[PDB]
Amino acid sequence: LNLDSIIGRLLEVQGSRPGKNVQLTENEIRGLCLKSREIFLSQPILLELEAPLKICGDIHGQYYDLLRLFEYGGFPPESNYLFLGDYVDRGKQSLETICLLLAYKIKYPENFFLLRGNHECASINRIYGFYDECKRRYNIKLWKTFTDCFNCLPIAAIVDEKIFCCHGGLSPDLQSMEQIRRIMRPTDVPDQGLLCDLLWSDPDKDVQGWGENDRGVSFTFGAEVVAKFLHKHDLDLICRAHQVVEDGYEFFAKRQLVTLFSAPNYCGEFDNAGAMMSVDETLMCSFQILKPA
Ligand SMILES: [Cl-]
Ligand SMILES: [Cl-]
Ligand SMILES: [Mn+2]
Ligand SMILES: [Mn+2]
């Protein structure tokens, strides 16, 4: 497995017309999945990370936008990175996207981190594009190799004991961080429960406590749920992704929560910006933004 050759080929298309594919070999991709899965299982399911770092939300196969985020933020390992999930589905280049991210995880495993999004799940990505992309460009056996790797991704991260990060949001079942630590891998994303909620829930300005989520999965939570959680666990901020936001980032509950979404012009259906959050050594947050086209 020649990681530098793989990364070189992935990066060669920088400056090309957004759309030019990078087609690694099936054995290369299988290697990326197997080695990264070993690393994910060797690190905790609840990551404990240090600032400074850059945090990115959803990518959804917008590979050329991933390359712009690295061009703006610094290619690994010039900056440390945490991604919050949803690497695949909807976009045109999920394969290049996930392969570059797994190659950087293997190259820089203590400086580059990937969380699980709700789309890193076989039954979801069966429907929303990644299965079809693997069947077209590779084969379904390689799709299953990716699933096996996805099933071992970590679920949440805490930066310097102060910023709690996950793809979706909070859970009415989350009373102790130990409940996250206890989750065994590999696992699928269940249709309900703590792991489902961490990958699927959303904040809501108009709900008091916990509400029913319009997605038909998981819950919504309001501002006082956020405040109570931060106080209980001695945290300063929840950082999550999952929802498209026009500015690429959006604060909630008097800046106690932020939503990041990193795929601009999302799947051609939205006129949103994509943002990456820069967290400095003192945990102050600023943004680098891919403005809409
Ligand atoms: Cl190396
Ligand atoms: Cl509330
Ligand atoms: Mn998403
Ligand atoms: Mn999502």
Query: Active-site residue numbers?
Result: 119
| Torsion angle, alpha carbons of 71, 94, 191, 148, to 10 | -100
CA–centroid distance, 205 to ligand 2, in Å, is 8
Query: How many angstroms separate the alpha carbon of residue 169 from the centre of ligand 2?
Result: 13
118 is in an annotated binding site: yes
Greatest C-alpha distance within the chain: 52
Instruction: Residue 137: name the closest of 27, 60, 23, 32 by CA.
Output: 23
156 Rama sector, left if φ>0, alpha if ψ -120 to 50, beta otherwise: beta
Fold of domain 1-293:
Purple Acid Phosphatase; chain A, domain 2 (3.60.21)
- Between the CA of 214 and the centroid of ligand 4 the distance, in Å, is 13
CA dihedral (283, 59, 250, 211) positive or negative: negative
Ligand in closest contact with the CA of 245: 3
Assess contact for 171 and 194: CB atoms under 8 A.
yes
d(CA 216, CA 200): 10
58: β partners: 261
Each domain of the chain, given as residue ranges in start order, spans: 1-293
Q: How far is CA 84 from CA 24, 99, 145, 211, 283, in A?
A: 25, 16, 21, 23, 18
Token pair 């012009």 in the structure block, residue: 265
Helix (H) or strand (E) holding 275: strand 274-279
Instruction: Starting from the CA of residue 2, give the closest ligand.
Output: 1
Is 242 annotated as ligand-binding?
A: yes
120 Cα–ligand 4 center, Å: 9
* Residues listed for the chain: 293
Q: Is 167 annotated as a binding residue?
A: yes
Ligand lying nearest the CA atom of residue 206: 2
Tell whether 204 is in a known binding site.
no
How many CA within 13 A on the CB side of residue 110? 0
Rounded CA gap, 267 and 241, in Å?
16
Mark out the alpha helices in 49-139 (DSSP H runs): 63-73, 94-107, 122-125, 130-137
